[PDB]
Design a protein around this ligand. Structure first.
Ligand SMILES: COc1ncc(F)cc1CNc1ccc(Cc2c[nH]c3ncc(C)cc23)c(F)n1
Length: 292
């Protein structure tokens, strides 16, 4: 990624952004909503999400932001990913301008939505099964696009899916703008904080990441969707027993709102042999057909 070249076609004048509230923050980074004036070929004026370093960041974090910018440019645009809209690299700190997604991350959306649906009994518009299938197929479409570019995401999870206008799902990555240090979904495994409960066995044990390991993580995401935002392996501590169980083929039980169909997809994503797992295109075609 560092050898990749940054194309100035993305360059945008930083004085043409008016910043609003912070959308998310990590230790050394954050994403901030902004209005951009004159953005793009149509000179649009619109709300954007700007990723930038915090004052706590150092050179290593700057290099990672620039690398992310180079990767987003190289990837190309797709309806079901968080697209790059421009960047500010001259005359100040690096700014990465991405699409703003009004409904926020999918995980929180499902949890708040489930609470809203249960409110009448205990005190707009409820979710339907078809919505869950749409979210699932949209994310699989976006993952099929990344896989077609041989791009490995490595942190597929509902917290990294964003919902835009029309409640269209987009796979993104909060990255530096996530507080992983204080986030119980990231486990201290040796040197780094890793989303172990989402990770394929070969990534945990052999440090191997592929499109097929993303497929596994996508199956965990499917479980999050069709449980309306439960934590995976709920109540189970990540320890030696957990690692062994995963390696031996232990799998989560069927989620409450998953049709047998969809749970079977999950199981296929969790095949121990990575080549046996479905491809994102197979998942997409099946889920599109199911969402009709
Ligand atoms: C496949 O995606 C990628 N792959 C590799 C990469 F290196 C980067 C990406 C996508 N980069 C990115 C940037 C910012 C954000 C946060 C974000 C954007 N819009 C929002 N609207 C609302 C809220 C609450 C948050 C946001 C996000 F999710 N992803």
């Amino acid at each position: 990624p560092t050898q990749l070249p940054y194309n100035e076609k993305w360059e945008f004048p930083r004085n043409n952004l008016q910043f609003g509230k912070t959308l998310g923050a990590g230790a050394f980074g954050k994403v901030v909503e902004a209005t951009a004036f004159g953005l793009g070929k149509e000179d649009a004026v619109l709300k954007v999400a700007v990723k930038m370093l915090k004052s706590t960041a150092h050179a290593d974090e700057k290099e990672a932001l620039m690398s992310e910018l180079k990767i987003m440019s190289h990837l190309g645009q797709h309806e079901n990913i968080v697209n790059l809209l421009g960047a500010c690299t001259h005359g100040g700190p690096v700014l990465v301008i991405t699409e703003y997604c009004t409904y926020g991350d999918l995980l929180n959306f499902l949890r708040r939505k489930a609470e809203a649906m249960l409110g009448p009994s205990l005190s707009g518009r409820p979710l339907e099964l078809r919505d869950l299938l749409h979210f699932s197929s949209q994310v699989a479409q976006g993952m099929a696009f990344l896989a077609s570019k041989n791009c490995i995401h490595r942190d597929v999870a509902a917290r990294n899916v964003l919902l835009t206008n029309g409640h269209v799902a987009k796979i993104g990555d909060f990255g530096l703008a996530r507080d992983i240090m204080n986030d119980s979904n990231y486990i201290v495994k040796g040197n780094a904080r890793l989303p172990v409960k989402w990770m394929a066995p070969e990534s945990i044990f052999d440090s191997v990441y592929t499109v097929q390991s993303d497929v596994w993580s996508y199956g965990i995401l499917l479980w999050e969707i069709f449980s309306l935002g439960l934590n995976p392996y709920p109540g189970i501590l990540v320890n030696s027993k957990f690692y062994k169980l995963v390696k031996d083929g232990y799998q989560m039980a069927q989620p409450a709102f998953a049709p047998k169909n969809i749970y079977s997809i999950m199981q296929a994503c969790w095949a121990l042999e990575p080549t046996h797992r479905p491809t994102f295109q197979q998942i997409t075609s099946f889920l599109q057909e199911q969402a009709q």
